[PDB]
Amino acid sequence: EMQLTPFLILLRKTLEQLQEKDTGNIFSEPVPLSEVPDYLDHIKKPMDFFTMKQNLEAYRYLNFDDFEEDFNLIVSNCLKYNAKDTIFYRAAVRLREQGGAVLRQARRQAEKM
Ligand SMILES: O=c1oc2cc(O)cc(O)c2c2ccccc12
Numbered sequence: 001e002m003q004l005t006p007f008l009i010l011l012r013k014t015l016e017q018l019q020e021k022d023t024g025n026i027f028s029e030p031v032p033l034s035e036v037p038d039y040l041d042h043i044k045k046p047m048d049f050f051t052m053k054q055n056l057e058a059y060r061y062l063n064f065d066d067f068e069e070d071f072n073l074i075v076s077n078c079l080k081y082n083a084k085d086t087i088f089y090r091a092a093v094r095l096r097e098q099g100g101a102v103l104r105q106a107r108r109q110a111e112k113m
Contacts, residue, residue, distance in 0.1 A: 002113035004062075010113075011056055011067055014106040018071060019049050021098040026091050027074050036081075043081060047073035064107045071099060 019028065030048045031039055039046070047070050052061075061067040078092035 002110075007062075007110060007113060008056065010106060010109055011061055011064075012053075014067070014102060015049065015052060015056065017102045017106075018095075018099050021095055021102065022049070022091075024091060026088065027078070027095065031077075039081065043077050045073055046077060047071075049074070064103075064110050068103055068107075071103065075099070 019025075022028065027048050029050050031043075031046060033039055052067075052070050052074075055061060055070065056067075061070075075092045075096045078088055082088040082092075
């Protein structure tokens with residue numbers, strides 16, 4: 001297996017690169033529940049990049065799949081909650097596309113560790 005600290009260095013850089021694709025900063029912080037009062041009704045597990053950074057430092061991500069699972073939640077939650085003809089829905093589609101390539105490259109670096 002691998003050493004913890006270089007893996008976490010790689011996840012930190014990967015998280016920064018995914019945030020870079022969210023040019024609108026739509027997903028930087030939790031969805032404001034005080035402004036979306038019905039959000040938790042059908043979104044079981046909210047996720048966002050700030051929570052992911054906290055989970056990263058809290059060792060919730062010890063393999064690439066758990067990291068990618070929470071990124072996929074950011075995307076899938078947004079596709080689920082929002083109608084297809086919204087800015088939010090299209091932002092999540094774009095993040096899924098642009099983020100997918102970021103993750104493939106980062107995983108190949110992890111797979112060399
Ligand atoms: O998925 C979202 O849906 C929203 C719906 C709204 O009506 C209002 C919102 O501020 C959001 C929102 C804000 C930040 C990140 C994601 C979302």
